[PDB]
Amino acid sequence: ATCELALENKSLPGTVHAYVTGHEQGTDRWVLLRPDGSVYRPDSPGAPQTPLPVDCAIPLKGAGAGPVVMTLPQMYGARVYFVRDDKLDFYLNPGPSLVEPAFATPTDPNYGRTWSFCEFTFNPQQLYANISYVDLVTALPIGLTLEGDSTHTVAPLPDGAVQRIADDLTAQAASDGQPWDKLVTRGSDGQVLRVVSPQNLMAPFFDRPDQMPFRDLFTAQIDEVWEKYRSTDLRIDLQGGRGTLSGRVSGDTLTFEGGHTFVKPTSKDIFTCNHGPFANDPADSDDKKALLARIAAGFNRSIMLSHPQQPNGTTVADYYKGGVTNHWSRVVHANSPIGYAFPYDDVRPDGEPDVSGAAHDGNPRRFTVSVGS
Ligand SMILES: OC[C@H]1O[C@@H](O[C@@H]2[C@H](O)[C@H](O[C@@H]3[C@H](O)[C@H](O)O[C@H](CO)[C@H]3O)O[C@H](CO)[C@H]2O)[C@@H](O)[C@@H](O)[C@@H]1O
Ligand SMILES: OC[C@H]1O[C@@H](O[C@@H]2[C@H](O)[C@H](O[C@@H]3[C@H](O)[C@H](O)O[C@H](CO)[C@H]3O)O[C@H](CO)[C@H]2O)[C@@H](O)[C@@H](O)[C@@H]1O
Numbered sequence: 001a002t003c004e005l006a007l008e009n010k011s012l013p014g015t016v017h018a019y020v021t022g023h024e025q026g027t028d029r030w031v032l033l034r035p036d037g038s039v040y041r042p043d044s045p046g047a048p049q050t051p052l053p054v055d056c057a058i059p060l061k062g063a064g065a066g067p068v069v070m071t072l073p074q075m076y077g078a079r080v081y082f083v084r085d086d087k088l089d090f091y092l093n094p095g096p097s098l099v100e101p102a103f104a105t106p107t108d109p110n111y112g113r114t115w116s117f118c119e120f121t122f123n124p125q126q127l128y129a130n131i132s133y134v135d136l137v138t139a140l141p142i143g144l145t146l147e148g149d150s151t152h153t154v155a156p157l158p159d160g161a162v163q164r165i166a167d168d169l170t171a172q173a174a175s176d177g178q179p180w181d182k183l184v185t186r187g188s189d190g191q192v193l194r195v196v197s198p199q200n201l202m203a204p205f206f207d208r209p210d211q212m213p214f215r216d217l218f219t220a221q222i223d224e225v226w227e228k229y230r231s232t233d234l235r236i237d238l239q240g241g242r243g244t245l246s247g248r249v250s251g252d253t254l255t256f257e258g259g260h261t262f263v264k265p266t267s268k269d270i271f272t273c274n275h276g277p278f279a280n281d282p283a284d285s286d287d288k289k290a291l292l293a294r295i296a297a298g299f300n301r302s303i304m305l306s307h308p309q310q311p312n313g314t315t316v317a318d319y320y321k322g323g324v325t326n327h328w329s330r331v332v333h334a335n336s337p338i339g340y341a342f343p344y345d346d347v348r349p350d351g352e353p354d355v356s357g358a359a360h361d362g363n364p365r366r367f368t369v370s371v372g373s
Contacts, residue, residue, distance in 0.1 A: 001074070001124070001363075002071050002073055002074065003071075003074075003122055003127055003148075003364040003365065003366065003367055004069060004070070004071060004072065004365060004366040004367070005020065005069070005070050005071070005072035005080075005366075005367050005369070006065040006067035006068070006069045006352070006366055006367065006368040006369065007058060007060055007067055007068040007069075007070075007080070007368075007369055007370075008060065008061075008066065008068070008368060008369070008370040008372075009060040009061065009062065009063050009064075009065075009082075009370070009371050009372050010063060010318040010370050010371065010372030010373050011063045011064065011372035011373050012063050012084065012140075012371060012372040013062075013063060014062075015059060015060065015062070015084075015085070016059075016060040016082055016083065016084055016086065016371055016372075017057040017058060017059055017060065017082070017086075017087050017088070018057075018058040018060055018068070018080055018081060018082050018083075018369070019032065019033070019034055019056055019058065019079070019080070019081040019082075019083075019084050019088060019090070019117075020032065020033035020055060020056075020058065020070075020072070020078065020079070020080050020081075021033075021078060021079050021081065021090070021098060021100070022054075022075030022076060022077060022078030022079070022121075022197065023076050023077045023078070024039075024041065024073070024074075024075055024076055025073070025074035025075055025076065025123055025124075029041050029096075030042060030072075030095075030096055030097070030098045031073070031075055032052070032054070032056040032090070032098075033056065033058060033059070033070060033072070034054065034055075034056055035055070035056070035057065035058045035059060037070045037071060039073060039166065040054045040056055042054070042096045042098070043091050044092070044094050044096040045092040045093065045094060045096060046097050047094075047284065048091075048093045048094065048099075049091045049093070050091055050092040050093070051089065051090075051091055051092075052089075052090040052091065052098075053092075053310075055087070056085075056090065057087040057088065058307070059072070060082075060286065060371075061173060063372055067206075067368060067370075069366075071159065072122055072367055073122075074122045074123055074124065075121070075122055076121040076122070076123055077119075077121065078119070078120050078121055078122065079100070079117040079119055079120070080117060080118055080120065080262075080369045081101070081115060081116065081117040081143070082115060082117070082140050082142060082369075082371045083110070083113055083114065083115035083116075083140070084113075084114040084115070084139075084140055084371075085113070085114065086113050086114075086115075088101050088110050088113065088115055088241050089101070089109040089110055101113075101115060101117075103115075103135070103136050103138075103194055103196060103200075104135070104136065104196045104200035104203075105204075105242030106185075111185065111193075112187045112188070113136070113193070114137075114139050114140055114191075114193050114194070115138070115140060115193075116138040116139075116140040116141065116142050116194075116371070117142070117348075118130065118131055118142045118369065119132065120367070122364065122367075125362065126360050126361060126362045126364070127146060127148070127360065127361055127364035127367055128358065128359075128360040129144055129146060129154070129359045129360065129361075129367060129369075130356075130357055130358045131144060131154040131156070131338070131339045131357030131358075131359075132299070132339055132340055132357055133157075133197075133244050133332045133336060133339050133340060133341045133357070134197060134340055134341065134342055134343050134345070135196060135197050135199075135200055136193040136194045136196040136197065136200065137157055137162045137163045137165050137335075137336070138157075138162055138193065138195075138196065138373050139163075139191065139193050139194065141156035141157030141158070141159075141161060141162070141190055141371070142144060142156055142369060142370065142371055143155055143156030143369075143370045143371075143373075144359055144367065144368060144369050144370065144371075145352060145359070145366075145367075145368040146359040146360065146361045146362030146364055146366075146367055146368075147361070147364070147365050147366040147367075147368070148362065148363045148364040148365050148366075149361050149362055149363050150361060151168070152359035152360070152361060153211070153263060153359070154338060154339065154357045154358070154359050155337040155338050156370070156371075156373065157335070157336050158335075158373070159337075159338070159372075159373050161335045161336055162192050162193075162194060162195055163192045164197045164331075164334075164335045165331050165332055165335045166181075166183075166186075166192040166195050167333050168331040168334065168335065169183055169184060169195060169328065169329075170184065171209060172327045172331065175231050175323070176323055176324075176327075178213075178214060178217055178327075179201065179213035179214060180198075180328070181296065182201055183195050183197070183198060183200075183201050183328065184366060187260040193327060195328075197271070197328045197329075197332075197341070197342065198213070198214050198217075198271045198326075198328050199268075199271040199272045200298065201213050201214075202214055202215075202268060202271060202272075203272075206268070208331060212245070212268060213289070214268075214271060214337075215266070215267055215268065216267060216269050217265040217267040217324060218265070218266070218270050218299065218324060219266070219267060220324065221302070221304075221305075221324045222264060222265055222266070222270075223264075223303060225251065225299070225304040225305055226249045226254065226264050226281040227249075228249075228304075228305055228308075229247065229248055229249040229254060229308075230248070230249040230250075232248075232308060233243050233246040233248060233308065234246070234247040234248070234249075234254070234256075234295075234304070234308055235247075235248065235308060235309040235310075236253065236291050236294045236298075236309075236310060237294070237309065237310065237311060237312040237313075237350075238287060238290040238291070238294070238313065239290070239311070239350055242287070242290065244309065245257050245258060245260065245287060245291060247260070247262075247291070249264075252264040254277070254295070256287075256291055258278060258285070258287050258288070260285070260287060260288040260291050261277075262277030262278075262291070262292070262295060263276055264270075264276075264277070265276050265278065265295075265296075265299060269296075269299075270296065270299045270300055270326065271300075271326065271328075271342075271345035272343070273296040273297075273300070273342065273344050274343065274344075277292065277295065277296075278292055278295070278296045278344075284287075291346045293346075293347050294310060294311055294344075294347050296343070296347075297311065297342075297344035297345065297346075298310050298311070298347075300325075300326040300329055300342045300345075301314075301318070301319035301320060301325065301329070301346065302311070302315075302319070302320060302321060302322055302324065302325035302326070303318050303319060306318060306321070310349075311347050311348060311349045311350075312349050312350050313349065314350065315348050315349060315352060316333075319333075320333070326341075326342055328342070329341035329342045330342060331344065338355050338356070338357050339355070339356065339357025340355070340356055340357060
Protein backbone atom coordinates (compact mmCIF):
# COMPACT_ATOMS: atom_id res chain seq x y z
CA ALA A 1 0.00 0.00 0.00
CA THR A 2 0.83 3.70 -0.01
CA CYS A 3 0.30 6.41 2.55
CA GLU A 4 -0.60 10.03 2.08
CA LEU A 5 2.11 12.44 3.25
CA ALA A 6 1.08 15.93 4.32
CA LEU A 7 3.78 18.56 4.65
CA GLU A 8 2.77 21.73 6.40
CA ASN A 9 4.23 25.02 7.56
CA LYS A 10 1.99 26.20 10.32
CA SER A 11 3.35 29.61 10.97
CA LEU A 12 6.76 30.36 9.72
CA PRO A 13 6.92 33.25 7.26
CA GLY A 14 8.25 32.77 3.82
CA THR A 15 9.19 29.56 2.25
CA VAL A 16 10.03 26.27 3.80
CA HIS A 17 11.19 23.33 1.77
CA ALA A 18 10.68 19.73 2.73
CA TYR A 19 12.70 16.77 1.53
CA VAL A 20 11.60 13.20 1.88
CA THR A 21 14.48 10.81 1.68
CA GLY A 22 14.40 7.06 2.15
CA HIS A 23 15.36 3.56 1.16
CA GLU A 24 12.89 2.08 -1.19
CA GLN A 25 11.05 -0.87 0.22
CA GLY A 26 12.68 -4.01 -1.05
CA THR A 27 15.14 -2.53 -3.48
CA ASP A 28 17.09 -0.63 -0.78
CA ARG A 29 17.62 2.08 -3.35
CA TRP A 30 17.80 5.54 -2.01
CA VAL A 31 14.78 7.43 -3.08
CA LEU A 32 13.67 11.03 -2.72
CA LEU A 33 10.23 12.37 -3.01
CA ARG A 34 9.88 15.01 -5.62
CA PRO A 35 7.93 18.24 -5.69
CA ASP A 36 5.77 16.83 -8.44
CA GLY A 37 4.79 13.83 -6.27
CA SER A 38 6.97 11.35 -8.08
CA VAL A 39 9.94 9.48 -6.71
CA TYR A 40 13.44 10.21 -7.64
CA ARG A 41 15.54 7.07 -7.49
CA PRO A 42 19.07 8.42 -8.09
CA ASP A 43 21.55 6.35 -10.02
CA SER A 44 25.04 5.97 -8.66
CA PRO A 45 26.95 9.16 -9.55
CA GLY A 46 30.11 9.37 -11.59
CA ALA A 47 32.02 10.88 -8.66
CA PRO A 48 31.68 11.47 -4.92
CA GLN A 49 30.06 14.68 -3.73
CA THR A 50 27.91 14.72 -6.85
CA PRO A 51 25.09 17.26 -6.38
CA LEU A 52 21.69 15.69 -6.34
CA PRO A 53 20.87 15.90 -10.08
CA VAL A 54 17.15 16.49 -9.49
CA ASP A 55 15.70 19.23 -7.30
CA CYS A 56 13.92 17.24 -4.62
CA ALA A 57 13.16 20.26 -2.43
CA ILE A 58 9.40 20.15 -1.92
CA PRO A 59 8.13 23.75 -1.58
CA LEU A 60 5.70 24.11 1.30
CA LYS A 61 2.66 26.31 0.91
CA GLY A 62 2.93 29.47 2.98
CA ALA A 63 2.31 29.40 6.73
CA GLY A 64 -1.31 28.46 7.29
CA ALA A 65 -2.12 27.74 3.64
CA GLY A 66 -2.48 24.03 4.36
CA PRO A 67 -0.35 21.02 3.55
CA VAL A 68 1.44 19.85 0.48
CA VAL A 69 -0.24 16.43 0.21
CA MET A 70 1.64 13.79 -1.79
CA THR A 71 1.56 10.02 -2.01
CA LEU A 72 4.18 8.56 0.31
CA PRO A 73 5.49 5.26 -1.07
CA GLN A 74 6.83 2.75 1.37
CA MET A 75 10.43 3.35 2.31
CA TYR A 76 12.63 2.78 5.31
CA GLY A 77 15.48 4.63 6.91
CA ALA A 78 13.44 7.58 5.70
CA ARG A 79 13.46 11.22 6.75
CA VAL A 80 11.35 14.27 6.23
CA TYR A 81 13.66 17.26 6.20
CA PHE A 82 12.61 20.83 6.46
CA VAL A 83 14.76 23.80 5.64
CA ARG A 84 14.01 27.45 5.99
CA ASP A 85 14.77 29.99 3.35
CA ASP A 86 17.32 27.95 1.49
CA LYS A 87 17.22 24.55 0.08
CA LEU A 88 19.39 21.69 1.30
CA ASP A 89 22.34 20.48 -0.73
CA PHE A 90 22.14 16.71 -0.98
CA TYR A 91 24.97 14.97 -2.76
CA LEU A 92 25.44 11.49 -4.16
CA ASN A 93 28.34 9.21 -3.61
CA PRO A 94 29.03 6.10 -5.71
CA GLY A 95 26.48 3.48 -4.79
CA PRO A 96 24.33 5.50 -5.00
CA SER A 97 24.91 6.67 -1.44
CA LEU A 98 22.91 9.79 -0.52
CA VAL A 99 25.15 12.32 1.25
CA GLU A 100 22.68 13.57 3.92
CA PRO A 101 23.22 17.01 5.47
CA ALA A 102 25.51 16.54 8.47
CA PHE A 103 23.83 18.71 11.11
CA ALA A 104 26.80 18.30 13.45
CA THR A 105 29.74 18.86 11.08
CA PRO A 106 30.57 22.56 10.57
CA THR A 107 32.18 22.05 7.13
CA ASP A 108 28.79 20.81 5.93
CA PRO A 109 27.17 22.81 3.10
CA ASN A 110 23.99 22.91 5.13
CA TYR A 111 25.57 23.64 8.53
CA GLY A 112 24.71 27.33 8.46
CA ARG A 113 21.22 26.56 7.25
CA THR A 114 18.09 26.38 9.37
CA TRP A 115 17.02 22.81 8.80
CA SER A 116 15.62 19.86 10.67
CA PHE A 117 14.45 16.37 9.98
CA CYS A 118 12.42 13.62 11.53
CA GLU A 119 12.98 9.94 10.88
CA PHE A 120 10.32 7.54 9.71
CA THR A 121 9.89 4.15 8.09
CA PHE A 122 6.94 3.06 6.02
CA ASN A 123 6.86 -0.67 5.30
CA PRO A 124 3.92 -3.08 4.82
CA GLN A 125 3.73 -3.56 8.60
CA GLN A 126 3.45 0.09 9.70
CA LEU A 127 4.40 3.66 9.17
CA TYR A 128 6.66 4.39 12.14
CA ALA A 129 7.73 7.98 12.55
CA ASN A 130 9.93 9.33 15.31
CA ILE A 131 10.44 12.76 16.76
CA SER A 132 13.75 12.30 18.51
CA TYR A 133 16.17 14.59 20.26
CA VAL A 134 18.83 11.94 20.72
CA ASP A 135 21.06 13.80 18.28
CA LEU A 136 19.85 17.33 17.83
CA VAL A 137 17.23 19.96 18.39
CA THR A 138 16.75 22.70 15.92
CA ALA A 139 15.22 25.99 15.15
CA LEU A 140 12.76 24.25 12.86
CA PRO A 141 11.04 21.76 15.20
CA ILE A 142 8.89 19.24 13.60
CA GLY A 143 5.59 17.97 14.76
CA LEU A 144 3.66 15.13 13.34
CA THR A 145 0.35 13.54 13.19
CA LEU A 146 -0.16 9.99 11.99
CA GLU A 147 -3.71 9.13 10.95
CA GLY A 148 -4.51 5.50 10.25
CA ASP A 149 -6.24 3.08 12.57
CA SER A 150 -5.87 5.78 15.20
CA THR A 151 -4.68 9.35 15.22
CA HIS A 152 -1.26 9.74 16.82
CA THR A 153 0.24 13.17 17.39
CA VAL A 154 3.71 14.07 18.51
CA ALA A 155 4.03 17.60 19.78
CA PRO A 156 7.03 19.47 18.37
CA LEU A 157 9.59 21.38 20.24
CA PRO A 158 7.68 24.53 21.16
CA ASP A 159 8.60 27.74 19.39
CA GLY A 160 11.95 28.88 20.74
CA ALA A 161 12.88 25.57 22.34
CA VAL A 162 16.24 25.44 20.62
CA GLN A 163 17.19 28.89 21.93
CA ARG A 164 16.15 27.84 25.45
CA ILE A 165 18.10 24.62 25.10
CA ALA A 166 21.11 26.48 23.77
CA ASP A 167 20.94 29.03 26.59
CA ASP A 168 20.45 26.40 29.31
CA LEU A 169 23.34 24.39 27.93
CA THR A 170 25.50 27.51 27.72
CA ALA A 171 24.51 28.34 31.29
CA GLN A 172 25.44 24.78 32.22
CA ALA A 173 28.79 25.27 30.49
CA ALA A 174 29.32 28.46 32.46
CA SER A 175 28.70 26.55 35.69
CA ASP A 176 30.69 23.37 35.03
CA GLY A 177 33.21 24.46 32.41
CA GLN A 178 32.18 21.52 30.21
CA PRO A 179 31.71 22.05 26.45
CA TRP A 180 27.90 22.16 26.58
CA ASP A 181 27.92 25.51 24.80
CA LYS A 182 29.87 24.01 21.88
CA LEU A 183 26.84 21.79 21.23
CA VAL A 184 25.17 24.98 19.98
CA THR A 185 25.20 25.93 16.31
CA ARG A 186 24.52 29.41 15.03
CA GLY A 187 25.19 31.31 11.83
CA SER A 188 26.79 34.70 11.26
CA ASP A 189 23.51 36.44 12.14
CA GLY A 190 23.34 35.04 15.67
CA GLN A 191 20.20 32.90 15.65
CA VAL A 192 20.53 29.41 17.14
CA LEU A 193 20.18 26.87 14.32
CA ARG A 194 20.52 23.64 16.22
CA VAL A 195 21.92 22.10 19.33
CA VAL A 196 23.43 18.65 19.07
CA SER A 197 23.82 16.02 21.69
CA PRO A 198 27.29 15.57 23.19
CA GLN A 199 28.07 12.36 21.28
CA ASN A 200 27.68 14.29 18.02
CA LEU A 201 30.28 16.73 19.35
CA MET A 202 32.43 13.92 20.71
CA ALA A 203 32.54 11.58 17.72
CA PRO A 204 34.96 13.73 15.63
CA PHE A 205 37.40 13.15 18.49
CA PHE A 206 36.71 9.43 18.87
CA ASP A 207 40.01 8.74 17.09
CA ARG A 208 41.80 11.10 19.54
CA PRO A 209 40.14 10.40 22.92
CA ASP A 210 42.51 12.62 24.88
CA GLN A 211 40.97 15.65 23.13
CA MET A 212 37.38 14.44 23.14
CA PRO A 213 35.00 17.03 24.59
CA PHE A 214 33.30 15.74 27.77
CA ARG A 215 35.76 12.82 27.98
CA ASP A 216 36.02 13.20 31.76
CA LEU A 217 32.55 14.58 32.54
CA PHE A 218 31.43 11.27 34.04
CA THR A 219 34.78 9.78 35.03
CA ALA A 220 34.61 10.67 38.72
CA GLN A 221 30.96 9.70 38.91
CA ILE A 222 31.54 6.44 37.16
CA ASP A 223 34.23 5.58 39.67
CA GLU A 224 31.87 6.44 42.49
CA VAL A 225 29.21 4.19 40.96
CA TRP A 226 31.60 1.31 40.32
CA GLU A 227 32.87 1.64 43.87
CA LYS A 228 29.35 1.62 45.33
CA TYR A 229 28.46 -1.59 43.56
CA ARG A 230 31.66 -3.27 44.63
CA SER A 231 30.10 -3.47 48.08
CA THR A 232 26.37 -3.65 47.38
CA ASP A 233 24.07 -4.96 44.72
CA LEU A 234 22.81 -3.04 41.76
CA ARG A 235 19.35 -4.41 41.05
CA ILE A 236 18.12 -3.76 37.53
CA ASP A 237 14.51 -4.51 36.85
CA LEU A 238 14.45 -5.92 33.34
CA GLN A 239 10.71 -5.18 33.48
CA GLY A 240 8.10 -6.73 31.26
CA GLY A 241 7.76 -9.30 34.00
CA ARG A 242 11.32 -10.49 33.45
CA GLY A 243 12.23 -9.57 36.99
CA THR A 244 15.30 -7.96 38.38
CA LEU A 245 18.89 -9.04 38.02
CA SER A 246 21.32 -8.17 40.77
CA GLY A 247 24.77 -6.99 39.80
CA ARG A 248 28.06 -6.41 41.55
CA VAL A 249 31.29 -4.79 40.46
CA SER A 250 34.26 -7.19 40.58
CA GLY A 251 37.34 -5.17 39.79
CA ASP A 252 36.05 -3.09 36.87
CA THR A 253 33.47 -5.56 35.63
CA LEU A 254 29.92 -4.99 36.79
CA THR A 255 28.63 -8.54 36.75
CA PHE A 256 24.99 -9.53 36.96
CA GLU A 257 23.49 -12.87 37.75
CA GLY A 258 23.42 -14.64 34.43
CA GLY A 259 27.05 -13.70 33.92
CA HIS A 260 26.14 -10.46 32.18
CA THR A 261 29.26 -8.36 32.32
CA PHE A 262 29.73 -4.64 31.86
CA VAL A 263 33.17 -3.15 31.86
CA LYS A 264 33.56 0.20 33.54
CA PRO A 265 32.00 2.80 31.23
CA THR A 266 33.42 6.11 30.12
CA SER A 267 31.77 9.46 29.60
CA LYS A 268 31.87 8.51 25.92
CA ASP A 269 29.99 5.29 26.64
CA ILE A 270 27.30 7.08 28.65
CA PHE A 271 26.77 9.67 25.93
CA THR A 272 26.83 7.33 22.93
CA CYS A 273 25.06 4.45 24.75
CA ASN A 274 26.94 2.40 22.18
CA HIS A 275 30.57 1.92 23.30
CA GLY A 276 32.29 0.25 26.23
CA PRO A 277 29.74 -1.73 28.26
CA PHE A 278 26.95 -0.23 26.12
CA ALA A 279 28.37 -1.29 22.77
CA ASN A 280 25.61 -3.09 20.95
CA ASP A 281 26.41 -6.72 20.28
CA PRO A 282 24.13 -9.25 18.52
CA ALA A 283 25.72 -11.93 20.75
CA ASP A 284 24.10 -10.19 23.73
CA SER A 285 21.24 -12.12 25.25
CA ASP A 286 17.97 -10.26 25.75
CA ASP A 287 18.69 -9.99 29.47
CA LYS A 288 22.13 -8.50 28.78
CA LYS A 289 20.53 -6.09 26.32
CA ALA A 290 17.87 -5.14 28.86
CA LEU A 291 20.57 -4.68 31.49
CA LEU A 292 22.65 -2.66 29.05
CA ALA A 293 19.73 -0.36 28.24
CA ARG A 294 18.86 0.26 31.85
CA ILE A 295 22.42 0.80 33.06
CA ALA A 296 23.15 3.25 30.24
CA ALA A 297 19.88 5.03 30.97
CA GLY A 298 20.63 5.12 34.69
CA PHE A 299 24.09 6.58 34.08
CA ASN A 300 22.67 9.17 31.70
CA ARG A 301 20.08 10.10 34.31
CA SER A 302 22.66 9.99 37.11
CA ILE A 303 20.57 7.67 39.27
CA MET A 304 23.24 4.98 39.63
CA LEU A 305 24.34 6.15 43.08
CA SER A 306 20.92 7.22 44.28
CA HIS A 307 18.89 4.21 43.12
CA PRO A 308 20.43 0.77 43.61
CA GLN A 309 17.22 -0.63 42.16
CA GLN A 310 16.01 0.75 38.89
CA PRO A 311 14.24 1.72 36.78
CA ASN A 312 11.20 0.71 38.82
CA GLY A 313 10.94 2.77 41.95
CA THR A 314 12.60 5.71 40.23
CA THR A 315 10.80 8.53 38.52
CA VAL A 316 11.74 11.32 36.19
CA ALA A 317 12.16 13.54 39.23
CA ASP A 318 15.16 11.40 40.17
CA TYR A 319 16.88 12.10 36.86
CA TYR A 320 19.59 14.61 36.11
CA LYS A 321 20.30 15.76 39.65
CA GLY A 322 23.71 17.14 40.48
CA GLY A 323 26.42 18.80 38.48
CA VAL A 324 27.51 15.68 36.60
CA THR A 325 24.65 14.34 34.49
CA ASN A 326 23.59 14.26 30.87
CA HIS A 327 22.69 17.93 30.82
CA TRP A 328 21.85 17.67 27.15
CA SER A 329 19.11 15.26 28.08
CA ARG A 330 18.12 17.23 31.16
CA VAL A 331 17.89 20.46 29.18
CA VAL A 332 16.19 18.94 26.14
CA HIS A 333 13.62 17.31 28.42
CA ALA A 334 13.08 20.56 30.29
CA ASN A 335 12.43 22.27 26.98
CA SER A 336 10.40 19.68 25.11
CA PRO A 337 6.99 18.17 25.77
CA ILE A 338 7.76 14.68 24.49
CA GLY A 339 10.49 12.73 22.75
CA TYR A 340 13.73 11.12 23.87
CA ALA A 341 16.93 13.03 24.43
CA PHE A 342 19.40 10.17 24.59
CA PRO A 343 19.59 6.66 23.11
CA TYR A 344 18.24 4.76 26.11
CA ASP A 345 15.72 7.39 27.12
CA ASP A 346 13.05 4.79 26.33
CA VAL A 347 14.01 3.13 29.61
CA ARG A 348 11.16 4.17 31.82
CA PRO A 349 9.87 2.97 35.18
CA ASP A 350 6.80 0.82 34.80
CA GLY A 351 3.68 2.94 35.02
CA GLU A 352 5.57 6.10 34.13
CA PRO A 353 4.11 7.50 30.91
CA ASP A 354 5.59 6.77 27.49
CA VAL A 355 7.49 9.87 26.49
CA SER A 356 8.77 8.64 23.14
CA GLY A 357 8.33 10.98 20.23
CA ALA A 358 7.22 7.99 18.17
CA ALA A 359 4.06 7.79 16.13
CA HIS A 360 3.22 4.51 14.50
CA ASP A 361 0.14 3.05 12.88
CA GLY A 362 -0.38 -0.32 11.23
CA ASN A 363 -2.53 1.10 8.43
CA PRO A 364 -1.35 4.68 7.94
CA ARG A 365 -3.63 6.84 5.84
CA ARG A 366 -2.05 10.28 6.29
CA PHE A 367 1.31 11.20 7.78
CA THR A 368 1.12 14.93 8.50
CA VAL A 369 4.53 16.42 9.17
CA SER A 370 4.57 20.07 10.13
CA VAL A 371 6.89 22.88 11.09
CA GLY A 372 5.87 26.03 12.89
CA SER A 373 2.93 26.11 15.33
O1 LIG B 1 19.41 11.38 13.72
C1 LIG B 1 20.80 11.55 13.42
C2 LIG B 1 21.42 10.20 13.07
O2 LIG B 1 20.78 9.67 11.92
C3 LIG B 1 21.18 8.32 11.66
O3 LIG B 1 20.45 7.94 10.88
C4 LIG B 1 19.19 7.30 11.10
C5 LIG B 1 19.36 5.78 11.03
O4 LIG B 1 20.13 5.45 9.87
C6 LIG B 1 18.02 5.07 10.98
O5 LIG B 1 18.22 3.65 10.85
C7 LIG B 1 17.15 2.98 11.52
C8 LIG B 1 17.63 1.71 12.23
O6 LIG B 1 18.97 1.86 12.72
C9 LIG B 1 17.54 0.52 11.29
O7 LIG B 1 18.32 0.78 10.11
O8 LIG B 1 16.19 0.24 10.91
C10 LIG B 1 15.31 1.37 10.91
C11 LIG B 1 14.13 1.10 9.98
O9 LIG B 1 14.44 1.53 8.65
C12 LIG B 1 16.07 2.63 10.50
O10 LIG B 1 15.15 3.73 10.38
O11 LIG B 1 17.24 5.59 9.90
C13 LIG B 1 16.91 6.96 10.12
C14 LIG B 1 15.91 7.42 9.07
O12 LIG B 1 14.61 6.91 9.39
C15 LIG B 1 18.18 7.79 10.07
O13 LIG B 1 17.87 9.16 10.33
C16 LIG B 1 22.68 8.27 11.37
O14 LIG B 1 22.94 8.86 10.09
C17 LIG B 1 23.50 8.97 12.44
O15 LIG B 1 24.84 9.14 11.98
C18 LIG B 1 22.91 10.33 12.78
O16 LIG B 1 23.57 10.87 13.93
O1 LIG C 1 16.80 8.83 17.52
C1 LIG C 1 18.00 9.12 16.85
C2 LIG C 1 18.48 7.75 16.42
O2 LIG C 1 17.62 7.21 15.41
C3 LIG C 1 17.64 5.79 15.45
O3 LIG C 1 16.73 5.03 14.60
C4 LIG C 1 15.28 5.01 14.81
C5 LIG C 1 14.66 3.67 15.26
O4 LIG C 1 15.59 2.63 15.00
C6 LIG C 1 13.28 3.27 14.71
O5 LIG C 1 13.05 1.87 14.53
C7 LIG C 1 11.66 1.56 14.34
C8 LIG C 1 10.95 0.80 15.49
O6 LIG C 1 11.86 0.48 16.51
C9 LIG C 1 9.94 -0.31 15.08
O7 LIG C 1 9.75 -1.44 15.93
O8 LIG C 1 10.22 -0.85 13.84
C10 LIG C 1 10.14 0.17 12.88
C11 LIG C 1 10.01 -0.47 11.51
O9 LIG C 1 8.73 -1.03 11.29
C12 LIG C 1 11.39 1.00 12.97
O10 LIG C 1 11.10 2.10 12.13
O11 LIG C 1 12.84 3.97 13.57
C13 LIG C 1 13.18 5.33 13.47
C14 LIG C 1 12.61 5.83 12.15
O12 LIG C 1 12.91 5.00 11.05
C15 LIG C 1 14.68 5.43 13.49
O13 LIG C 1 15.11 6.74 13.26
C16 LIG C 1 19.10 5.33 15.27
O14 LIG C 1 19.36 4.84 13.96
C17 LIG C 1 20.25 6.25 15.76
O15 LIG C 1 21.47 6.13 15.02
C18 LIG C 1 19.91 7.71 15.92
O16 LIG C 1 20.85 8.32 16.80
